[PDB]
């Protein structure tokens, strides 16, 4: 069976078994607590096909995390605006960060992945080698002790949370090796099934590919674990239409040269091949 | 309805049937699956395994010891619970490069992370009053004030403190959730020894869920157990196979015997397990 069926099955489960739950945004959701799906990474890449995923956003965001950037502008300049509202003058001021430059998200993913526990100053500070470089640690451990059961990168940092523009959804991930295959499990505390989760599966599948490449291993599985898995009330009808679509076989991800360290990957090193997502169809709602 | 213990028993079977041989830190070797998830209802029952006795006394005294912030193995040892004693021993501490540490001093393990995340650890006797993040009370305050919140997390995985810990935490984080007046908890356990650890760990986090449900005026919902490396040690295969032949009987009940207002105020005598009479733990003899 096609891996995307697992996603569709989760969407169906929430539509059928989920409870209505109010949320932070005021939008409302149908929600289930606790879900898990497994996406093979073997000779295919799980970029969902029943609705186009913003792959450009996935890849530039991840390269921004890796370089340790906490500057929304450094992502925005690549045409990816996902962090912009959280770095805006008015949003930063709303949190009491009037001293910050526009774009300064505080100690979010890039900073935690590369400098966990360092004292955050501003997004322009030199953190060269302060704090824990979890990303490099994970990579070193996979190479030296691939049986290790502690190969973890954690972005959830309770001491730092109040300085972040928003709290991390991807609380931690763990890697694992057996049979020359590298697998990753993501603990995602909160998943927008219609709009966030497909991008999220692609982000951590890519990270797996990148690390497998550096460490000389084959991608195995990406296990996706959710806390509050929810469908926003506004996405219920679109996802009903989507659930009726037959997934197309997943694309392949190609890495276009031999890359030796995680810091050396660049956007042009990657190719998604054979990505055939369903075209959108117009749907009307009326009262 | 299908008994909740069947979730655990099915995981053990799945590992035995579909797990890969995987070498490990101890040198024993394991059968291993990466990524599993079970759900244990906590509604009118308490998931203490009936097919093999679980060390309940240990579960309860250990949790109370976490809640009070203790990182001293001796404080738990005096309760007759020796589970952390070897990791606080002179010899073990010295092996880790902690020759100056007092016997019993585990470093900034769960107790410390749950009550004081981010404080600078000195030793087990230091006053950390008002230092770091008290994530345990913050969880409880959030459940009370904004139960819909999607960030109710307590995290013991602290990369900065890891090198000071006697051992790295297996229960990396947990998350709480509220719906329909019911409190649920999900545990992300990075490594589970299905034979020896997991039964105990299910009970600890189901117990934590009952305590917090009690303080917050909610009914226990589900405990969702998520595993990273779910493994059976090669020396536990034959015992587990015996255990798998055992029919599950009804899980017991947990009663809390008084009205407790804050988490720090729970005491051992506040708890009663009713209707627990498990099969004995499994011992096998072989002439080799
Ligand atoms: O990578 C991401 C980031 C956010 N969200 C969704 C989950 C929630 O719908 C919302 C975050 O709001 P809270 O969980 O913080 O309330 O964004 C995702 O699905 N994936
Ligand atoms: O609460 C606990 C603590 C430990 N373990 C098991 C998992 C591993 O078998 C071993 C820990 O070793 P590492 O995962 O750290 O190698 O103990 C548990 O199951 N539960």
Curated annotation (Swiss-Prot), chain A:
Chain positions recorded as dUMP binding sites: 24, 149-150, 169-170, 189-192, 200, 230-232
Assembly description: Homodimer.
UniProt binding sites for (6R)-5,10-methylene-5,6,7,8-tetrahydrofolate: 192, 286
A single GO cellular-component term on record: cytoplasm
UniProt main location, coarse: nucleus
Lineage of source species: Eukaryota, Metazoa, Chordata, Craniata, Vertebrata
Function: Catalyzes the reductive methylation of 2'-deoxyuridine 5'-monophosphate (dUMP) to thymidine 5'-monophosphate (dTMP), using the cosubstrate, 5,10- methylenetetrahydrofolate (CH2H4folate) as a 1-carbon donor and reductant and contributes to the de novo mitochondrial thymidylate biosynthesis pathway.
Glycyl lysine isopeptide (Lys-Gly) (interchain with G-Cter in SUMO2) crosslink site(s): 266, 282
Identification of the protein by name: Thymidylate synthase
This protein's record includes keyword Electron transport: no
InterPro entries for this protein: Thymidate_synth/dCMP_Mease, Thymidate_synth/dCMP_Mease_dom, Thymidate_synth/dCMP_Mease_sf, Thymidylate_synthase, Thymidylate_synthase_AS
Record carries keyword Nucleus: yes
Enzyme nomenclature, EC number: 2.1.1.45
SUPFAM superfamilies to which the protein is assigned, alphabetical: Thymidylate synthase/dCMP hydroxymethylase
Record keywords, A-Z: Cytoplasm, Isopeptide bond, Membrane, Methyltransferase, Mitochondrion, Mitochondrion inner membrane, Nucleotide biosynthesis, Nucleus, Phosphoprotein, Transferase, Ubl conjugation
Catalytic reactions on record: dUMP + (6R)-5,10-methylene-5,6,7,8-tetrahydrofolate = 7,8-dihydrofolate + dTMP
Pathway: Pyrimidine metabolism; dTTP biosynthesis
GO biological process, one term: methylation
CDD domains xref list: TS_Pyrimidine_HMase (cd00351)
Localisation: Nucleus; Cytoplasm; Mitochondrion; Mitochondrion matrix
Recorded name of the encoding gene: Tyms
UniProt GO molecular function: mRNA regulatory element binding translation repressor activity; sequence-specific mRNA binding; thymidylate synthase activity
Uppermost EC category: transferase
From Swiss-Prot, chain B:
Residue(s) of cross-link: Glycyl lysine isopeptide (Lys-Gly) (interchain with G-Cter in SUMO2): 267, 283
Coiled coil region boundaries: none
Catalytic residues, chain numbering: 170 (nucleophile)
Positions that bind (6R)-5,10-methylene-5,6,7,8-tetrahydrofolate: 193, 287
Pathway(s) of this molecule: Pyrimidine metabolism; dTTP biosynthesis
Cross-referenced HAMAP family: Thymidy_synth_bact
Protein name: Thymidylate synthase
Gene: Tyms
């Amino acid at each position: 069976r096609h891996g995307e069926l697992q996603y569709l099955r989760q969407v169906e489960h929430i539509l059928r078994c989920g409870f209505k739950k109010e949320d932070r945004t005021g939008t409302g959701t149908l929600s289930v607590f606790g879900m898990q799906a497994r996406y093979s990474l073997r000779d295919e890449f799980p970029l969902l096909t029943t609705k186009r995923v913003f792959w450009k956003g996935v890849l530039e965001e991840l390269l921004w995390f890796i370089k340790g950037s906490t500057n929304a502008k450094e992502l925005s300049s690549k045409g990816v605006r996902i962090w912009d509202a959280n770095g805006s003058r008015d949003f930063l001021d709303s949190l009491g960060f009037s001293a910050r430059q526009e774009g300064d998200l505080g100690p979010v993913y890039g900073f935690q992945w590369r400098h966990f526990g360092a004292e955050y100053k501003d997004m322009d500070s030199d953190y060269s080698g302060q704090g824990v470089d979890q990303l490099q640690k994970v990579i070193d451990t996979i190479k030296t002790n691939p049986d290790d059961r502690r190969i973890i990168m954690c972005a959830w940092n309770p001491k730092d949370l109040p300085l972040m523009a928003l709290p991390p959804c991807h609380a931690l991930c763990q890697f694992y090796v057996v049979n020359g295959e590298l697998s990753c499990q993501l603990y995602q505390r909160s998943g927008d099934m219609g709009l966030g989760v497909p991008f999220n599966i692609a982000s951590y599948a890519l990270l797996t590919y990148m690390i497998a490449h550096i460490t000389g291993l084959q991608p195995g599985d990406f296990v996706h674990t959710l806390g509050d898995a929810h469908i926003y009330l506004n996405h219920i009808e679109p996802l009903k239409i989507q659930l009726q679509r037959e997934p197309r076989p997943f694309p392949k991800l190609k890495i276009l040269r031999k890359v030796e360290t995680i810091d050396d990957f660049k956007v042009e090193d990657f190719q998604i091949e054979g990505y055939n997502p369903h075209p959108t169809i117009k749907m009307e709602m009326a009262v």
